[PDB]
Amino acid sequence: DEDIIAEENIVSRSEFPESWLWNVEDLKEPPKNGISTKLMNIFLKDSI
Amino acid sequence: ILGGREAEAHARPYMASVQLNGAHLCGGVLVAEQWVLSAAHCLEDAADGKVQVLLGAHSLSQPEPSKRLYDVLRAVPHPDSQPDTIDHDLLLLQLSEKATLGPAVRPLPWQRVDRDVAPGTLCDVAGWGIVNHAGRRPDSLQHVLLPVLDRATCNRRTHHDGAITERLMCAESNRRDSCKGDAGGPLVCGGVLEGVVTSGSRVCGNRKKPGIYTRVASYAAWIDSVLA
Amino acid sequence: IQKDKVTLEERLDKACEPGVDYVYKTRLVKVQLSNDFDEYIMAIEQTIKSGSDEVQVGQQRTFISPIKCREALKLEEKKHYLMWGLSSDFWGEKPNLSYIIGKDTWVEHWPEEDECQDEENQKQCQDLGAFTESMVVFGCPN
Amino acid sequence: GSCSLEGVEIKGGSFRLLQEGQALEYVCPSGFYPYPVQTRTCRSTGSWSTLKTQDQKTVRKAECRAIHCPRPHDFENGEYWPRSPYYNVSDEISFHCYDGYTLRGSANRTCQVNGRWSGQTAICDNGAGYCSNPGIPIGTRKVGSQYRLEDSVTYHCSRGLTLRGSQRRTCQEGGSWSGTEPSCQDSFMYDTPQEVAEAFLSSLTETIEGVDAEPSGSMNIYLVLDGSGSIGASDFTGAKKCLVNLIEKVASYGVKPRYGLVTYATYPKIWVKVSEADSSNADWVTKQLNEINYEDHKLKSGTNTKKALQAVYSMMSWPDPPEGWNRTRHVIILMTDGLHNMGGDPITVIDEIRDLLYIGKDRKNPREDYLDVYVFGVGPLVNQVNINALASKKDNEQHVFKVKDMENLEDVFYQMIDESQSLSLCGMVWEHRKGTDYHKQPWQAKISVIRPSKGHESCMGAVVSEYFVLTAAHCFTVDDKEHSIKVSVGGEKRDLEIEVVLFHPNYNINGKKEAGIPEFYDYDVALIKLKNKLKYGQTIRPICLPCTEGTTRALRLPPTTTCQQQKEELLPAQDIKALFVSEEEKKLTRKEVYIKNGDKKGSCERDAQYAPGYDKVKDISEVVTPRFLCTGGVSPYADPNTCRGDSGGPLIVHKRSRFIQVGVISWGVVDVCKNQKRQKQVPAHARDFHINLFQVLPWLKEKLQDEDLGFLAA
Ligand SMILES: *[C@@H]1O[C@H](CO)[C@@H](O[C@@H]2O[C@H](CO)[C@@H](O[C@@H]3O[C@H](CO)[C@@H](O)[C@H](O)[C@@H]3O)[C@H](O)[C@H]2NC(C)=O)[C@H](O)[C@H]1NC(C)=O
Ligand SMILES: *[C@@H]1O[C@H](CO)[C@@H](O)[C@H](O)[C@H]1NC(C)=O
Ligand SMILES: *[C@@H]1O[C@H](CO)[C@@H](O)[C@H](O)[C@H]1NC(C)=O
Ligand SMILES: [Mg+2]
To answer: Which parts of the sequence belong to the Peptidase S1 domain (chain B)?
Structure first.
């Protein structure tokens, strides 16, 4: 009606994988205490 | 004549228009008072037709006081001219009478000294041949100055691959070239006729395949002969 | 489509819309109520705008429309109607096509000859009459 | 009368009246676009045209909205970052594939100002199917994961977007999806004049190089111009001028096709008919193209495209079996806005035409290469849905174009005229009636060598140019002189005299005797420069080589295609379907094989240990250098094995009616050939190795520099 968001400006979810993040990572960072550490920035799916 | 210009009216009295059945066929040049030099291959498609020569003309359609259509009294193609090759592609046409000399009609001096033209020399070539790949037939005479490429380079494999005899000469064709309908045209290298347009068929403007012209100087013997 | 004066220029643009395919002046010959699909058998009197269906005058074409709309159509046999529809309203394989009267199909009662003498139809028979020739001779503008 | 300008303005922008106020065009600031429509017409009701969207929806107020590039709403076998509800201009998104999957196509893509993503579509494939993964063009959605033979896929575009190309593609025999790659179009994407001219010609010239086989006059070009009042004199005259330069551009190739000129409105108007004695006269057709005017169809400004295509139909039809019908290529080019309102669906005619030319009416003989349809959007308002439904859908080719400014195409065509560029002729094979061997493999060369009682060496090669013959390097030795080496091509009885045999600088067959390796076929390639120039005939033709301008056109790729891109095309990361020519009882016959370039590559290479002599090789990779392609075996199929006499022969990849050599038959593991028959009991490890041409390019490009093959820098 007068308020709320337009039923057109609504970007619906769609990506609902049962599995993902099937990638590989190598730990070449500066080793401290024999414990290398990487910080991955991944994107979560639309699934709840 | 690709990338040519509209020549000035009757600025080239020697320029002739060999016509088959009242229609332009090949280019010609008035070498004598009653003789027209041209390409021999022009009479290969003739046979059943009425060959003529239009002198002192600029426009093939519009009426001009200096225009006059002569009749061919005799056609003498060089004895060693085959339809298969370009070698010895010369033709001498005798008019029915001496051409009425005037401000628009005059014979042209042709080279006798059999020495190659200095590479880089600017030569003028004219004709009524098409001006575009579509095949547009010009009404007025066209012309263009072309640098003379040395036979050394013209014979490179990348070009004509040694198919250029000592009796033939080359001229740059980088988008500017004598196309179809210019066959038999005059190649004047400084007030003097040095070559005659003759390259059979190609694709006008192909820089990788320079234009081929028959050196009149290397045929002086035969020419003098005929005019006797 | 719809049902507030629908002038001449109104009919011209509406009948020349990209969607509109056919435009006929038909006569409702027979009306049927058969199981799944309801049937209106029309007889094309003249093809105002030849559509993608090669049909000549005198032939018959069957039209289909749901019952819920039958009350609104109130079509009566032997009566003539000016109707045009979309190319997306065809049904079946040729030459057995069947026009479908959908929410985008224009239908209008065509007052017969002797009825165009009425001081209530004279204003309509002139619009339709003008619409016909304009669409036949010149055809759709643009 | 002139429609009122009340409530016509647009929020965040202005407008400009055109065609003397009969139409308006919204003017939006840099980075924004008019919504919903670009322009508006003045109806005969005093009011402007209704604001219709792409989904045929109605909008009250016009708004200038930011330009966004279609957001990926479907992607498989990998991930893409970052994900956003929408992407602005200059926004970048990159793609990555899961493990075990190879990535082909642009890894990083940027949202450009034309509302399109830069680079090519990203595709994550595993190369495990008969056909490769068609991929999912950004903005679309693919339905179909099975890529077997006969299998299919379907594409759908987001709401508000129009699908260009094929909506369904079927995996055809010979590893190649039907139709063309889809693409989600919006209502402002257009096409730059160069892009159009570049793609329109890269698809036309090719279907002309083949026409040279060989008045006249063996191709027809039907020019159907739309003279409806819905185009305006502006976008109409600009369409003629574009055609004029196109005729000249074609003429510059020295080819004389038969033309058919037709302008249409309420009725079709024929100016030139292909049956006319002057149809092939380019100048003739051009004079007509000039005489026609936009005022020709003002009295009856209808838009009956159906009848227009019916005009073309009657031109290609017959009174009822001309001798030359199944050998003629038909090309239809029509400018229109796609807004037809009379006659109905024009597509019905296209189908009738295809029935007339016997196209798509034979499983074994599609005959698709005999009909091309190009559609140019010209009018202010153009229906991309309808012009896409008429235009042809051929793999890697574009037939639908929406000219932006137009008129510029004319100036681009004129600039693209170059008499210096030659017309290709490599990899050409046409179904001639007699079809004597060497007509089916003109490039095939038969090499022989005579030695003092030692015997005769029997190898094969391919004609790559007018002077050279590419073959294997082990067929000859430093001792063998030119007089003892005879080459024969075209099946000619006589033998050609050679000038010199050029071996590859790195060819050393004995450079492994210390490691205990008798044979070392690394860089096993050589060229044979003939003493005489070859006259290309019906039996003698060249074969296309990798990384050449001539090959690019064969694959129908943009001229700006780099060498690396060609390798990804010809030799993808999978089981590539190829073939080679073998000698079968003094008769040439083809043998279809599979190049194990996928994951089976390892299984194929190591089998080299079974080869004679290699039995004690420590590291098998020491005898199989990266210069080798591997074929033969049992997986995924039972491939035929090369014979001794086939050695040196071309490893050919038949794609899109063109043959491309990608290797040279070097050596095999097991000798199944034994001049008596073919060892009916071939082992599973009977593999065959070849030389990857993409590995000896420096040597090829150098030695063939004066052959006008136009190799690519890279
Ligand atoms: C897609 O985008 C990424 C991000 O640029 C590309 O990876 C990048 O590769 C380049 C070239 O090696 C690296 O550039 C580096 O820039 C830093 C800036 O200080 C400089 O110090 C380095 O010398 C180097 O020039 C960049 O580090 C690297 N990005 C990473 C690893 O995060 C990638 O190539 C692109 N994919 C394509 C287009 O194939
Ligand atoms: C993209 O640009 C629009 C218009 O300026 C802006 O409203 C929007 O916030 C931007 N998108 C992002 C990065 O959120
Ligand atoms: C006509 O052309 C086709 C091309 O596929 C060919 O197969 C056929 O043999 C030709 N017809 C005749 C009578 O040879
Ligand atoms: Mg129109």
So the answer is: 1-228
Tell whether residue D303 is among the known ligand binding residues.
yes
Residue D639 annotated among the catalytic residues of the structure: no
List beta partners, residue D594: D577
> Considering only CA atoms, which of D196, D187, D208, D541 is closest in space to residue D381?
D187
Instruction: Provide the 8-state DSSP code for D243.
Output: H
Using an 8 Å Cβ cutoff, are D624 and D689 in contact? yes
Peptide bond into D452 cis (omega under 30): no
Domains of chain D: 1-68 (2.10.70.10), 69-185 (no CATH), 186-432 (3.40.50.410), 433-714 (no CATH)
Query: CB of B32 within 8 A of CB of B16?
Result: no
Here the CATH number for the domain that contains residue B44 is: 2.40.10.10
Q: Is B163 on the interface with D (CB under 8 A)?
A: no
Q: Which residues pair with D688 in a beta bridge?
A: D631, D668
Report the gap between the CA of A45 and the closest CA in chain D (Å): 10
Angle at C135 between CA C102 and CA C22, to 5 degrees: 25
Instruction: Give the DSSP letter of residue D403.
Output: B
How close, in Å, is residue C142 to chain D by CA atoms?
Answer: 4
Q: Which listed ligand is nearest to D432 at the C-alpha? A: 3
CA pair distance D448, D460, nearest whole angstrom: 8
User: Annotated catalytic, D524?
Assistant: yes
Structural contact between residues C45 and C80, judged by C-beta atoms closer than 8 angstroms: yes
Give CA D651 to chain center in angstroms.
20
How far does D123 lie from chain A, in Å, by closest CA? 16
Provide the number of structural domains found in chain B. Answer: 2
Ligand nearest to the CA of D71: 2
Q: CATH says C1-142 is which class? A: mainly beta
Distance between CA atoms of residues B146 and D252, nearest Å: 21
8-state DSSP, B116: P
Determine the Cα–Cα distance for residues B122 and C64; give it in Å rounded to an integer: 83
Q: How was this structure determined?
A: X-ray
Residue positions counted in chain D: 714
Whether residues B213 and B226 fall in one domain: no
Q: Are residues B140 and B211 in the same domain?
A: yes
Give distance in angstroms: CA of B139 to centre of ligand 1: 64
- Map out the domains of chain C as residue ranges: 1-142
Q: Please report how many Cα atoms fall inside a 13 Å half-sphere around the Cα of residue D252, on the Cβ side.
A: 22
- The neighbours of chain A, by the rule of 3 or more Cβ pairs under 8 Å, are D
> Does residue B78 share a domain with residue B32?
yes
Residue A28: CB atoms within 10 A of its CB come to 8
| D19 burial type by CB count under 10 A (0-12 exposed, 13-18 middle, 19+ buried) | middle
Cα–Cα distance measured from residue B148 to residue A26, given in angstroms and rounded to the nearest whole number: 67
CB contact at 8 A, B208 and D420: yes
Of C13, C87, C141, the CB nearest to D301: C141
**Are B37 and B127 within one domain?**
no
How many folded domains does chain A comprise? 1
**Where in the sequence is the domain holding B66, given as residue range(s)?**
13-107+218-228
D279 is in an annotated binding site: no
CA distance to B7, B49, D97, D628, per residue, from D649 (Å): 58, 55, 37, 15
**Which CATH number do you get for residue A45?**
2.20.130.20
User: Which residues on neighbouring strands pair with residue D334, listed in sequence order?
Assistant: D224, D375
D424 marked ligand binding residue: no
Identify the chains in contact with B, defined as 3+ C-beta pairs within 8 A. Answer: D
**Domain housing A11:** 1-48
Asked if residues D242 and D268 have their Cβ atoms less than 8 Å apart, the reply is no
Taking the C-alpha atoms of residue D167 and residue D156, their distance in angstroms, rounded to an integer, is 7
Expressed in angstroms and rounded, the spacing between residue D307 Cα and the centre of ligand 4 is 13
Distance, first Cα to last Cα, chain A:
29
Q: Name the one residue in this structure whose structure tokens are 């003028």.
A: B124
Q: Residue D2: count other Cβ atoms within 10 Å of its Cβ.
A: 10
Residue D647 known to be catalytic: yes
